[PDB]
Amino acid sequence: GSLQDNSSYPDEPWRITEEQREYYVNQFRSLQPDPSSFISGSVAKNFFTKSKLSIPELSYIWELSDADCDGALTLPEFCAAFHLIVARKNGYPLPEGLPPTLQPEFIVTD
């Protein structure tokens, strides 16, 4: 009788309407003086550490953020970067992140 589920609202395309993009730019802006422009790579990876709680696990968070070894990410690029950081403080399981995806650490399945 407890734990119900009369609500339907999946998530993927990050669909929205100035409801999340506003808070997404207010952060990337705290460091980026320009309205949009692009933030550096070592600069964003410096504060990005604020969710995984201890254990520096930003190695996979950034590996997915950057996509051209440019060590930089325009504002549009940061829009997805933070989307991955919230997944930790949100409690969302890890769907993907690396090319592989089966048992790179559990060979013996028995």
**Residue ranges for the binding site?**
66, 68, 70, 77
- Which residue's CB is nearer to Ca ion, number 61 or number 73? 73
CB of 64 to Ca ion, least distance (A): 10
Residue 46 burial (C-beta neighbours within 10 Å; 0-12, 13-18, 19+): exposed
Q: Residue type for 2, please?
A: S
CB-CB contact of 60 with 100 (8 Å): no
Residue number of the CB atom closest to Ca ion: 66
Reading phi first (left if > 0) and then psi (alpha if -120 to 50, else beta), residue 14 is in left
- Which residue's CB is nearer to Ca ion, number 64 or number 87? 64
Tell me the binding residues for Ca(2+): 66, 68, 70, 77
- Which residue's CB is nearer to Ca ion, number 14 or number 89? 14
- Which residue's CB is nearer to Ca ion, number 57 or number 70? 70
**CA quadruple 32, 24, 26, 50: dihedral sign:** negative
Residue matched to tokens 């993907």: 96
Give contact residues for Ca ion (rule: CB under 5 A): 66-67, 70, 73
